[PDB]
Amino acid sequence: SGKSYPTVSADYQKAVEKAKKKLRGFIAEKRCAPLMLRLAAHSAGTFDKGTKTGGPFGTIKHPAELAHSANNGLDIAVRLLEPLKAEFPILSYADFYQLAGVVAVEVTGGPEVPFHPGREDKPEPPPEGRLPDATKGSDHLRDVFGKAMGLTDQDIVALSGGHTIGAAHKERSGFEGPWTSNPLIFDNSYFTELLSGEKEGLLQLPSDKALLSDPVFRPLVDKYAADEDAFFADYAEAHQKLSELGFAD
Ligand code: HEM
Ligand code: NA
């Protein structure tokens, strides 16, 4: 909602379609879907609505932004994508990274998130410190996703479900291990695990646990644990919004 997507040329559209295919094959083969989803989220998640700065505009590949502590390990993601990006010189990096995030969800069996091209690469990275802190709680989540990004409480819970794929690494954030028993499968297991308690071998961040005790977040966790279809619908909506922050309005 509220979006007016720009016109891109037929050749640009052709390149998007071909890049989508190539990204599917590459991401599946390399087993890097979760890392690519993290990359897309960290690129988009710097948007501040009050200043209209940051967001998914290709700045994450700048050495200055990759050096942000919250971005530890994302240099791997950028390097992995560089050879493929080079096959699509017409595409913006911004579009390519957001397309990679959409593909990461699709190949792991998640919903089909709508994608619209036309993000323009911006010259200057946003200041460090906008991304969410895993050690903080609900107030902080609302500060970051709500007050800065302009997303809803529903979006916060659905997007937290991105942790259904992948793992933390002690050398990156310091946290360690997968949230789920099937970390390459995009399903509602993140929420099922969050409800069932601390199972040995599985990770819960303080920011994940914050969802269980918040009056608004908890009913959403309950809904998504009970209804994977409802999770997929809300997730697709939220991911689209995240990927389009500051873009096309
Ligand atoms: C809600 C606030 C969030 C917090 C506090 C948070 C924090 C973290 C942390 C600490 C890690 C581990 C990084 C590492 O050590 O390798 C991580 C990984 C990850 N995050 Fe988030 N995140 C949040 C939101 C999101 C969102 C919105 C998405 C996308 C929808 C997402 C997708 C992922 C994925 C897929 C991984 C796994 C990366 C891998 O396997 O290499 N996260 N997150
Ligand atoms: Na999973």
For the Cβ of 73 lying below 6 angstroms from any atom of ligand 1, the answer is: yes
* CATH fold group of domain 1-131+239-249: Peroxidase; domain 1 (1.10.520)
For the Cβ of 172 lying below 6 angstroms from any atom of ligand 1, the answer is: yes
Domain boundaries, the chain: 1-131+239-249, 132-238
Separation CA 88–CA 122 (nearest Å): 18
Ramachandran angles phi, psi of 158, nearest 5°: -60, -45
Separation CA 62–CA 46 (nearest Å): 14
| Cβ atoms of residues 49 and 148 within 8 Å | yes
Counting from 1 in the atom list of ligand 1, the atom nearest the Cα of 239 is 30
Single-letter amino acid code for the residue at 8: V
| Cβ atoms of residues 244 and 149 within 8 Å | no
| CATH class of residue range 132-238 | mainly alpha
Strands, E, within 132-231: which ranges?
Answer: 167-168, 177-178
For this PDB entry, the determination method is: X-ray
| Cβ atoms of residues 193 and 199 within 8 Å | yes
Ligand number nearest CA of 167 is: 1
For the Cβ of 34 lying below 6 angstroms from any atom of ligand 1, the answer is: yes
Counting from 1 in the atom list of ligand 1, the atom nearest the Cα of 173 is 15
Separation CA 98–CA 95 (nearest Å): 5
Separation CA 172–CA 179 (nearest Å): 16
